[PDB]
């Protein structure tokens, strides 16, 4: 009882974009920075290209394609968009370029210059992005600060849909078997029974917010991952970050209740944080908050992917 996915998957030629730099590298493959020029259009689009390392199992190619499947069927201002894929002797994914990169990396290198207005704004945008995912009945299953990218300091997007699995019309929960998982971000439901729902994503939202509020601290640092299940069962949670009013921390704690029903909805999270974003100083106490402020390659035909539509 669900609607046809009429999303368009676009196939891009090798000649159609220019690799200009290297961002990150791995055995799986490396990430390039470059410009995407669909010629005949007279436009250059800054993209992040993830070029496969041709030393790959068939199984590896697939995992990316399913993420590519997921990314192509989403259209939200706060969800990272897929531009297309290139079937070279190695399948590479072309996505919009996020110059400031990881939000987790961003808060850590700018701890000195991040104000309450920004922190609260991000919370709203992520809740907005996650809510879209709920409307499209999808579960991210890996919501973390490391998986939120920064287009501009005022605009962040959700990414990393490798573990993002969708539910059909009559589903509420569904199980997985194994593989390496982010224990510290996961609800108790998921650790004990491998059960992932939208409310399990609400948990990871609270952890993600806690990451931002602590300016990139590690949840349950020092504590081995083995003890997490046991500790949460004892009723222990993450400590209240110093800059947080009780109002903000109250909301985080709500994301961490054993009863998933008791947890807030993303639509509810948008409302509360939006309330707080109107009066940022009342809800986050940061030193020098009053004076904080935050911020190339031929760039005349440059358009950003968001302004480029099909």
């Amino acid at each position: 009882g669900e609607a046809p996915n009429q999303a368009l998957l676009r196939i891009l030629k090798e000649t159609e974009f220019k690799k200009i730099k290297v961002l990150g590298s791995g055995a799986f493959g490396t990430v390039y920075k470059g410009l995407w020029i669909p010629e005949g259009e007279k436009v250059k689009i800054p993209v992040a290209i993830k070029e496969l390392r041709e030393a790959t199992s068939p199984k590896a190619n697939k995992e990316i394609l399913d993420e590519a499947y997921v990314m192509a069927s989403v259209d939200n201002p706060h969800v990272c968009r897929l531009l297309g894929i290139c079937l070279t002797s190695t399948v590479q994914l072309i996505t919009q370029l996020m110059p400031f990169g990881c939000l987790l990396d961003y808060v850590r290198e700018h701890k000195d210059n991040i104000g309450s207005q920004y922190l609260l704004n991000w919370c709203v945008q992520i809740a907005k992005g996650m809510n879209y995912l709920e409307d499209r009945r999808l579960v991210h299953r890996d919501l973390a600060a490391r998986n939120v990218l920064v287009k501009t300091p005022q605009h962040v997007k959700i990414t990393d849909f490798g573990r993002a699995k969708l539910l059909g019309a009559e589903e509420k929960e569904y199980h997985a078997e194994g593989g390496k998982v982010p224990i510290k971000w996961m609800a108790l439901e998921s650790i004990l029974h491998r059960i992932y729902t939208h409310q399990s994503d609400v948990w990871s939202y609270g952890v993600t917010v806690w990451e931002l509020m602590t300016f990139g601290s590690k949840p349950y640092d020092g504590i081995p991952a083995s003890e997490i299940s046991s500790i949460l069962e004892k009723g222990e949670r993450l400590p209240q970050p110093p800059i947080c009013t009780i109002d903000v921390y109250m909301i985080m704690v709500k994301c961490w209740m054993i009863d998933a029903d008791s947890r807030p909805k993303f639509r509810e999270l948008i409302i509360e944080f939006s309330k707080m974003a109107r009066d940022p100083q009342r809800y986050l106490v940061i030193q020098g908050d009053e004076r904080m402020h935050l911020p190339d390659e031929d760039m005349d035909d440059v358009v950003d992917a968001d302004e480029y539509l099909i």
């Binding site: 490391r146 194994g178 390496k180 998982v181 982010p182 224990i183 971000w185 991952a225 083995s226 299940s229």
Partner: peptide, 7 residues
């Protein structure tokens, strides 16, 4: 270092 395989 954030992804583990528990039982």
């Amino acid at each position: 270092t954030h992804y583990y395989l528990l039982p």
